[PDB]
Design a protein around this nucleic acid. Structure first.
Ligand SMILES: [Ca+2]
Ligand SMILES: [Ca+2]
Ligand SMILES: [Ca+2]
Ligand SMILES: [Cl-]
Ligand code: NA
Length: 290
DNA sequence: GGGGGCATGCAGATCCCACAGGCGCG
DNA sequence: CCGCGCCTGTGGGATCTGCATGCCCC
């Protein structure tokens, strides 16, 4: 199994990973973990992450889903080494930090003492979705949840390839002209993301030299889109970036099909019946995969 | 002998993905 | 007239995240 470039691995973790701190009434169960859950079609990504890290278990989740779970205490140390040298970039970095704090508590066995469990609860309260009702009623003293916002730049193209392989999308639009009858083609690249990382997403315009940020009304949704629709930007900026910075998983196959369409458009063949037919065949290939 | 962490799951919540159509512009 | 692509708008499921517990080892 091929191994993933370390920065590409961190990008994919920014997109799809999850740091978990479970605190359950057994006396208390305490379980730190890092988890990536994907559809079966991208199990190879998890296997390649597994062999790159040499830690974690791959488990099936129902018939359609699969997840890589790192939970062994010693394995947690491998994850922390990786993320110190190749740190997260999104607000998830703040969950990694707290995760690393909880690992330090448990490493010192401080979670066995009374004040230990309370210390983990103070950390978990700031992780992900906070404390459940149970832990709130048992620890009414733990009130603080606000943590510092992350503000980091895109570090490099390999990180972007990993992030894009998780939260990105390469797709081909066909629009039948309601004014005429000719079918148009439009290549689109889009990354969507929760507005908590609006600054990072906005920096994509500067990093890539193209694109637009689209938002709804503040009441409508909590996520926004980065999108490129102008073909000369697709062809001259987006494609070379991901030829250099290799995608992983099914997103790599989408990108390869995507570039076949780009080449036809560059050759003006999208305005002929034979070129349009080939683009429809490529799009059929993409719809099948995903 | 038993406390604690492992092994191996199952389930709930939402943030993505992969698009759609109106229409102004050059 | 035309093709392009800016811009508004979105269904639904693949993600993110949380919740469980019997077994085993030192
Ligand atoms: Ca994500
Ligand atoms: Ca994904
Ligand atoms: Ca994702
Ligand atoms: Cl680059
Ligand atoms: Na680049």
């Amino acid at each position: 199994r091929e191994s993933i470039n370390p920065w590409t691995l961190t990008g994919f973790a920014d997109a799809e990973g999850s740091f978990g701190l479970s605190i359950l009434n057994r006396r208390y169960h305490t379980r730190l973990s890092f988890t990536i859950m994907l559809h079966n079609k991208d199990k190879s990504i998890l296997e390649n992450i597994q062999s790159t890290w040499k830690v974690g278990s791959i488990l099936n989740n129902g018939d359609h889903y699969v997840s890589l779970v790192v939970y062994r205490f010693e394995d947690l140390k491998v994850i922390i080494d990786h993320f110190e040298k190749y740190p997260l970039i999104t607000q998830k970095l703040g969950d990694y930090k707290l995760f690393k704090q909880a690992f330090s508590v448990m490493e010192n066995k401080e979670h066995l003492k009374e004040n230990g469990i309370k210390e983990l609860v103070r950390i978990k309260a700031k992780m992900n979705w906070g404390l459940n009702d149970e832990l709130k009623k048992a620890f009414p003293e733990v009130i603080s949840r606000e943590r510092p916002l992350i503000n980091k730049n895109i570090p490099n193209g390999k990180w972007l390839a990993g992030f894009t392989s998780g939260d990105g999308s390469f797709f081909v639009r066909l629009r039948k002209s309601n004014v005429n009858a000719r079918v148009r083609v439009q290549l689109v690249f889009e990354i969507s993301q929760h507005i908590r990382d609006k600054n990072l997403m906005n920096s994509l315009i500067t990093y890539l030299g193209c694109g637009h940020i689209y938002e709804g009304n503040k009441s409508e949704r909590s996520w926004l889109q980065f999108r490129v629709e102008k073909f000369s930007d697709i062809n001259d900026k987006i494609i070379p970036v991901f030829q250099e910075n290799t995608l992983i998983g099914m997103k790599l196959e989408d990108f390869e099909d995507w570039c076949k369409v780009a080449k036809l458009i560059e050759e003006k063949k999208h305005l002929t019946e034979s070129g349009l037919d080939e683009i429809k065949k490529i799009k059929l290939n993409m719809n099948k995969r995903r």
